[PDB]
Amino acid sequence: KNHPMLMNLLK
Amino acid sequence: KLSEEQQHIIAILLDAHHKTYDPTYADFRDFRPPVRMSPLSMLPHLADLVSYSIQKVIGFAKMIPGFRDLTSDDQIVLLKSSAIEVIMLRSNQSFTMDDMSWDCGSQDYKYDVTDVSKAGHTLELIEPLIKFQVGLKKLNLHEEEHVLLMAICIVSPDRPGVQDAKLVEAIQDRLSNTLQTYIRCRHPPPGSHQLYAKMIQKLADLRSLNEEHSKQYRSLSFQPENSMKLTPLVLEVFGN
Numbered sequence: 001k002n003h004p005m006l007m008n009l010l011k
Numbered sequence: 012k013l014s015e016e017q018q019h020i021i022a023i024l025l026d027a028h029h030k031t032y033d034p035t036y037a038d039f040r041d042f043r044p045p046v047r048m049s050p051l052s053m054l055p056h057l058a059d060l061v062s063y064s065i066q067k068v069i070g071f072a073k074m075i076p077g078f079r080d081l082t083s084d085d086q087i088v089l090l091k092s093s094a095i096e097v098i099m100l101r102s103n104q105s106f107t108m109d110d111m112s113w114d115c116g117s118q119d120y121k122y123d124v125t126d127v128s129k130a131g132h133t134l135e136l137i138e139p140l141i142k143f144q145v146g147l148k149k150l151n152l153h154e155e156e157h158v159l160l161m162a163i164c165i166v167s168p169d170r171p172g173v174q175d176a177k178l179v180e181a182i183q184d185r186l187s188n189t190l191q192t193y194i195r196c197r198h199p200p201p202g203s204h205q206l207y208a209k210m211i212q213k214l215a216d217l218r219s220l221n222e223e224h225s226k227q228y229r230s231l232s233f234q235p236e237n238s239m240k241l242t243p244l245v246l247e248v249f250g251n
């Protein structure tokens with residue numbers, strides 16, 4: 001929900 | 012008995028920690044320099060340290076068996092709420108009761124109460140943080156128990172914003188039973204006495220430390236000039 005950087009580091 | 016699967020789980024978490032915690036602290040040189048003179052003189056440096064550590068905490072969580080089975084959203088909520096707690100936990104490895112500081116290999120990167128204070132925090136957080144470090148150190152955990160505790164901390168069902176709490180709880184239960192069984196079969200007495208319950212109590216201490224940190228963080232970050240010295244990842248993870 002608007003967490004670009006967390007989501008990218010998790011992928 | 013410690014089943015093969017439970018031993019596999021411990022093996023995975025040990026390796027995951029190995030790949031995400033550098034005991035040589037070589038990367039600290041990349042951070043903005045620590046200034047120990049001056050208000051918030053340690054904020055740029057410790058903001059960087061924390062930002063670097065959030066990245067490492069994320070890499071660790073990705074290798075937690077089952078964690079990848081969660082939805083992107085639940086992964087995100089679990090990390091947002093647990094990140095500061097796992098950083099407090101993982102930092103025990105560099106904390107030393109010799110002088111109650113976090114000792115990262117050199118004087119420049121040795122942090123005490125007044126450093127944390129010069130990062131914008133107060134004794135209301137700092138004192139119980141040290142008492143936490145001290146009581147964790149006193150458990151003298153096996154590294155196996157250390158990584159299991161971090162993993163259990165990350166996959167907690169009651170975190171705000173969780174969607175599939177049933178599945179979060181199922182993953183945690185696997186790690187919890189792995190820990191309970193490890194202690195019985197591998198931690199000899201007297202060190203094992205109530206050790207599980209003491210470790211779970213530390214997870215409660217962490218919730219309390221999380222709550223206070225968030226409060227002092229909101230006060231710190233509410234000032235645009237302070238929030239300016241943070242990093243983009245810290246603003247996204249800890250809030251902005």
Ligand SMILES: C=C1/C(=C\C=C2/CCC[C@]3(C)[C@@H]([C@H](C)CCCC(C)(C)O)CC[C@@H]23)C[C@@H](O)C[C@@H]1O
Pocket residue numbers: 057058060061064098099101102103104105106113115122127130131132136224228245
């Ligand atoms: C990070 C790590 C380390 C120490 C942790 C510390 C010492 C300094 C003060 C810190 C960073 C505490 C502060 C309350 C956090 C302030 C953060 C902020 C200003 C953004 O609100 C939390 C844990 C403490 C060193 C090493 O163990 C790696 C670990 O990974």
